[PDB]
Amino acid sequence: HMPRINVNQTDSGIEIILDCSFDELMNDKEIVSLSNQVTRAYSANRRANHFAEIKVAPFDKRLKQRFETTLKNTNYENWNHFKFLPDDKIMFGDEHISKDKIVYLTADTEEKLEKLEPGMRYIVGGIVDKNRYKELCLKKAQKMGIPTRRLPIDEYINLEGRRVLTTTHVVQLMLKYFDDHNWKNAFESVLPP
Numbered sequence: 001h002m003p004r005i006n007v008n009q010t011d012s013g014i015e016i017i018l019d020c021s022f023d024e025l026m027n028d029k030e031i032v033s034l035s036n037q038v039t040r041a042y043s044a045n046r047r048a049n050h051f052a053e054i055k056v057a058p059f060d061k062r063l064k065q066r067f068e069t070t071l072k073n074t075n076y077e078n079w080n081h082f083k084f085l086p087d088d089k090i091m092f093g094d095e096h097i098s099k100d101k102i103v104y105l106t107a108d109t110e111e112k113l114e115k116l117e118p119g120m121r122y123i124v125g126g127i128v129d130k131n132r133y134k135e136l137c138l139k140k141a142q143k144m145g146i147p148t149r150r151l152p153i154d155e156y157i158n159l160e161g162r163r164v165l166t167t168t169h170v171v172q173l174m175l176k177y178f179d180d181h182n183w184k185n186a187f188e189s190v191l192p193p
């Protein structure tokens with residue numbers, strides 16, 4: 001339909017996949033949190049000075065059920081720059097971005113992301129677990145044969161804080177990054193000190 005947008009926004013040139021293949025791992029409350037994190041990602045994307053092409057893949061099971069029902073009047077099927085895919089094939093390469101340009105983001109890997117680059121596709125785990133499934137996305141990316149990178153933000157997080165961000169905080173941070181290409185500023189915008 002007619003979403004509210006930042007009419008001055010331009011394409012960052014990146015894709016972000018919310019990897020929502022973890023239905024069976026969450027309880028009902030967490031499926032709720034996830035759906036709301038997805039709607040917040042959309043809000044961040046519409047507001048951002050630079051948008052990404054965001055995809056939810058696979059979009060299935062209780063998450064899909066919740067959109068078909070409690071969130072039916074969000075008009076999700078028609079969202080701007082934000083798409084819902086029936087499987088995870090996009091994570092292995094497609095006609096727009098090939099496999100050598102795909103990275104899986106995870107807090108559990110050593111190698112830091114240096115920058116976000118136009119033409120790349122970044123996968124973010126779509127799961128609300130408060131990091132109870134230790135190294136889940138790291139081991140999965142390894143199995144998929146996709147390189148892993150962590151967000152270069154540990155320099156800005158003190159021990160007492162949460163270094164394993166929510167799905168939506170990661171998206172918000174990634175969008176904010178394009179304003180100045182400054183990780184610290186993007187972090188401080190999303191998680192005020």
Ligand SMILES: Nc1ncnc2c1ncn2[C@@H]1O[C@H](CSCC[C@H](N)C(=O)O)[C@@H](O)[C@H]1O
Nearest residue numbers: 105106107124125131136137150151164165
């Ligand atoms: N510091 C960080 N660096 C890179 N990715 C991060 C991150 N903090 C959160 N994320 C991303 O946000 C998603 C939600 S957090 C989910 C944690 C889950 N146990 C896991 O193994 O990943 C993660 O799947 C990861 O893609």
